[PDB]
């Protein structure tokens, strides 16, 4: 036969049914929403018009994004949107020259950054672009919190964001231990990102982790039918007394 829904809608149906529906609304919104990462290696067409070939007249234009590969190591590091470009090159930037298989490597680094919220210095893989963003963000903690997941391009950074958001949300004394006065300043300094504790927990969680977490939340030990009947019997007897 023929499937009523196309294959791509199968993923949508799965998300709309089962434990996926029972997932927290705040987390579901974060997963559902998609934000484009900031372009770094390609620019969209400046002009919106160009000459159509067949008619020889001005026409609307379209944009072809350059392919950029972001390795999982970026998800374990803090890259500022830089990525590996895999493809072919024409030597000397002229079409008349030979085609050479080329892998374009942005300069990668491992560096240490201080987090005021976590009161710890983290040594992580980073690029020069990220370092400028951190300075522009007015602090490493700001960059993690301010930058969105796609622009951040780091699962660990999102995981760091999850920890930072929860730390801000709970006003946990873990921040700057033995310095309550200093702790308040950090919370006040990063007060903008204070959010409900429930939302902060699910920030950056992977789909497999989220499904297991929701399953663990909803898993409950079997009820002894003796207790269930006791509660039912008391309710009926209590109603009878009325």
């Amino acid at each position: 036969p023929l499937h009523r829904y196309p294959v791509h809608l199968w993923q949508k149906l799965r998300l709309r049914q089962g434990i996926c529906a029972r997932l927290p609304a705040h987390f579901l919104r974060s997963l559902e929403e998609e934000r484009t990462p900031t372009p770094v290696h390609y620019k969209p067409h400046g002009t919106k018009f160009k000459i159509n070939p067949k008619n020889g007249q001005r026409e609307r234009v379209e944009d072809v994004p350059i392919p950029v590969h972001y390795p999982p190591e970026s998800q374990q590091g803090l890259w500022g949107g830089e990525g590996l470009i895999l493809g072919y090159r024409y030597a000397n930037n002229d079409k008349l020259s030979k085609r050479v298989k080329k892998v374009w490597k942005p300069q990668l680094f491992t560096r240490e950054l201080y987090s005021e919220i976590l009161d710890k210095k983290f040594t992580v893989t980073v690029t020069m672009r990220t370092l400028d963003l951190i300075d522009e963000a007015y602090g490493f903690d700001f960059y993690i919190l301010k930058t969105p997941k796609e622009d951040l391009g780091s699962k660990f950074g999102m995981d760091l964001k999850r920890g930072m958001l929860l730390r801000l949300a709970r006003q946990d004394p873990h921040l700057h231990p033995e310095n309550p006065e200093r702790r308040a300043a950090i919370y006040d300094k990063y007060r903008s990102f204070v959010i409900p504790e429930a939302e902060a927990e699910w920030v950056g969680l992977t789909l497999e982790e989220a499904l297991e977490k929701q399953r663990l939340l909803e898993e409950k030990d079997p009820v002894p039918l003796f207790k269930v009947y006791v509660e039912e019997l008391v309710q009926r007897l209590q109603e009878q007394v009325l």
Binding site: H41, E62, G87, R89, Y90, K95, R111, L131, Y138
Partner: protein, 95 residues
């Protein structure tokens, strides 16, 4: 950072279609790559003293990895935010 641009224009797909890439469309041109260039300038303040590029606490503009590989690596430089920029330069007045 590396920047490339497609050599061959891909036929426009219109309102609701995706252009079909081909072998010639897969070739890209390198408009600019930092690898071939010498290191670009980077803004950094100094957390220690380096020979003949200044002394701790000053704001110096140095080529990106040149500053990072030498200055920041040894601890001579650190990343310069505006808040610590004024604080670090202010320390130089006291230095």
């Amino acid at each position: 950072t590396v920047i490339v641009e497609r050599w061959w224009k891909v036929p426009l797909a219109g309102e609701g279609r995706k252009p079909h890439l081909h072998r010639r469309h897969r070739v890209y041109k390198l408009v600019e790559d930092t690898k071939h260039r010498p290191k670009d300038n980077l803004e950094l303040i100094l957390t220690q003293s380096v020979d003949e590029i200044g002394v701790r606490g000053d704001l110096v503009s140095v080529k990106k990895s040149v500053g990072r590989n030498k200055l920041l690596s040894q601890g001579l430089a650190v990343y310069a935010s505006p808040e610590n920029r004024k604080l670090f330069e202010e320390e130089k007045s006291l230095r």
